[PDB]
Design an enzyme around this catalytic site. Structure first.
Site, PDB file in Angstrom:
ATOM      1  N   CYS A   1       0.833  -1.100   0.213  1.00  0.00           N
ATOM      2  CA  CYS A   1      -0.081   0.002   0.087  1.00  0.00           C
ATOM      3  C   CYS A   1       0.920   1.299   0.051  1.00  0.00           C
ATOM      4  CB  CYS A   1      -1.041   0.061   1.133  1.00  0.00           C
ATOM      5  SG  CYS A   1      -1.580   1.608   1.486  1.00  0.00           S
TER       6      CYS A   1
ATOM      7  N   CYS B   1     -10.060 -10.657 -21.839  1.00  0.00           N
ATOM      8  CA  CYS B   1     -11.051 -11.979 -21.830  1.00  0.00           C
ATOM      9  C   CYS B   1     -10.508 -13.117 -21.558  1.00  0.00           C
ATOM     10  CB  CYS B   1     -11.849 -12.061 -22.942  1.00  0.00           C
ATOM     11  SG  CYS B   1     -13.450 -12.907 -23.053  1.00  0.00           S
TER      12      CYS B   1
ATOM     13  N   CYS C   1      -8.279 -20.634 -14.646  1.00  0.00           N
ATOM     14  CA  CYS C   1      -8.354 -21.890 -14.142  1.00  0.00           C
ATOM     15  C   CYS C   1      -7.782 -23.268 -14.741  1.00  0.00           C
ATOM     16  CB  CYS C   1      -9.759 -22.256 -13.609  1.00  0.00           C
ATOM     17  SG  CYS C   1     -10.573 -20.779 -13.019  1.00  0.00           S
TER      18      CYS C   1
END
Ligand code: CL
Ligand code: ZN
Ligand code: ZN
Ligand code: ZN
Ligand code: ZN
Ligand code: ZN
Ligand code: ZN
Ligand code: ZN
Ligand code: ZN
Lengths: 76, 382
Positions: free
Chosen positions: B171, B348, B366
């Site tokens: 961060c 995509c 996946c």
């Protein structure tokens, strides 16, 4: 769906609307509730002035979100 | 010694301290004054969280400087929504597509979505509606909260900026690895965690240092002050909670009015947003029931209308921290079935094996055959 129209005074109007309703329809729905002419009404959402032609959908205003009512007075 | 404190308001209150008074002690001065638990208060000086063992004098608090008090308690997803109920928080969301004309789940897309623009801009994506009688050619993408089972009309706003911190980017403010994070649209694409984002927003709101852009509204750029980085989707401020978000909305309405030329009614407890004509100095707080107060004041002195005559704070950001807090500062994979290398063109995740004997349709993420789950969770990479 229900939306709230808040004045900077803290006055609150509850409106039964639909995402497809234009800023003009909202203003007309306010006139039926509080008798304020639409030409005097100015609506704001997250600091942006909402233009008459645009719908609520266009501004991604969700169920139970509030709009700010500001007045263009004539006399101043 | 006097320090001016801002705590959930632009109205700063003075507080009597000593130079040797610790930050622990100042938190106690405030806690007793407001009747809130001191162990929940964060002290912010020029965008820096003050360590409690340090004294007022060590923090270079000089005179009447603004100290902020902020009260704070204690599957692959490309999309995050703000769930207004029952979650009352940011949640991984499910992308859903429908035909724009009949609003049914019958739209078959040409190619699938590759970026936020495809799913956020209306009628950007094209397709063909498979309903009995519908000539719909455009697609309508919507989002739903993934955390619970959803009603077809129960949609949620997509907070496109929030990302699972899969990358382990530290961060910009605290240099920690948190998830999910906010990614600013500045060139560097600086990342802030949602806790530091809360301190950034709440303090900036207290200082009325949010930016007003006529065609955007009231927003904030990147902490680092990068140009062309204003948060475009203003529902991102819902992350602050309903009380802070409502306060942000009010201050925004007030800035908008003053930016539109009008004035706010000067009367105590009124503050009505009034828009007079260019040449009008006599301003009446018009409106019946509300904004009815209904005082006739002078636009200049703000006193009862008469006939005659009448600390900008810096949010300190480390250069080294900004360098490490950058989102972008893995070309081909084999097809799961036939092991032939497939290249990825665009965002995509819906892959198509080119191999004729195969032609498998799989998920890039996946390594499984294409499905409605992969579509809803991560149709495109972010
Ligand atoms: Cl960092
Ligand atoms: Zn939810
Ligand atoms: Zn259709
Ligand atoms: Zn930046
Ligand atoms: Zn942080
Ligand atoms: Zn008034
Ligand atoms: Zn005057
Ligand atoms: Zn293959
Ligand atoms: Zn997948």
């Amino acid at each position: 769906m229900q939306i709230f129209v808040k004045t900077l005074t803290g006055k609150t109007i509850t409106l039964e609307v639909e995402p497809s309703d234009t800023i003009e329809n909202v203003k007309a729905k306010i006139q039926d509730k509080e008798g304020i002419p639409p030409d005097q009404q100015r609506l704001i959402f997250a600091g942006k002035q909402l233009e008459d032609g645009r719908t609520l959908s266009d501004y991604n205003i969700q169920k139970e979100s509030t709009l700010h009512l500001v007045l263009r007075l004539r006399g101043x | 010694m006097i320090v001016f404190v801002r705590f959930n308001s632009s109205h700063g209150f003075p507080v009597e301290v000593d130079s040797d008074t610790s930050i622990f002690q100042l938190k106690e001065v405030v806690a007793k004054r407001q009747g809130v638990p001191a162990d929940q208060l964060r002290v912010i000086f020029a965008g820096k969280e003050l360590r409690n063992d340090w004294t007022v004098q060590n923090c270079d608090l000089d005179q009447q400087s603004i100290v902020h008090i902020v009260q704070r308690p204690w599957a692959t997803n490309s999309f995050y929504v703000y769930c207004k109920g029952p979650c009352q928080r940011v949640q991984p969301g499910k992308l859903r597509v429908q035909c724009s004309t009949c609003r049914q789940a019958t739209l078959t897309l040409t190619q699938g979505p590759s970026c936020w623009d495809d799913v956020l801009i209306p009628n950007r994506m094209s397709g063909e509606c498979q309903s009995p009688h519908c000539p719909g050619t455009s697609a309508e993408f919507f989002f739903k909260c993934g955390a619970h089972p959803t009603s077809d009309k129960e949609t949620s706003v997509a907070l496109h900026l929030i990302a699972t911190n899969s990358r382990n980017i530290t961060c910009i403010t605290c240099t920690d690895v948190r998830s999910p994070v906010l990614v600013f649209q500045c060139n560097s694409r600086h990342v802030i965690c949602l806790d530091c984002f809360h301190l950034y927003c709440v303090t900036r709101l207290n200082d009325r240092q949010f930016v007003h852009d006529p065609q955007l509204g009231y927003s904030l750029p990147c902490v680092a002050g990068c140009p062309n980085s204003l948060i475009k989707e203003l529902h991102h401020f819902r992350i602050l909670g309903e009380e802070q978000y409502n306060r942000y909305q009010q201050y925004g309405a007030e800035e908008c009015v003053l930016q539109m030329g009008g004035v706010l009614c000067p009367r105590p407890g009124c503050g009505a947003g009034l828009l007079p004509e260019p040449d009008c100095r006599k301003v009446t707080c018009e409106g019946g029931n509300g904004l009815g107060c209904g005082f006739a004041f002078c636009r200049e002195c703000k006193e009862a209308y008469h006939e005659g005559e009448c600390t900008t704070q810096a949010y300190r950001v480390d250069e080294r921290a900004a360098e490490q807090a950058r989102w972008e500062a893995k070309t081909t994979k084999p097809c799961p079935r036939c092991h032939v290398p497939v290249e990825k063109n665009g965002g995509c995740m819906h892959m198509k094996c080119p191999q004729p004997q195969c032609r498998l349709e799989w998920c890039w993420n996946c390594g499984c055959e294409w499905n409605r789950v992969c579509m809803g969770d991560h149709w495109f990479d972010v």
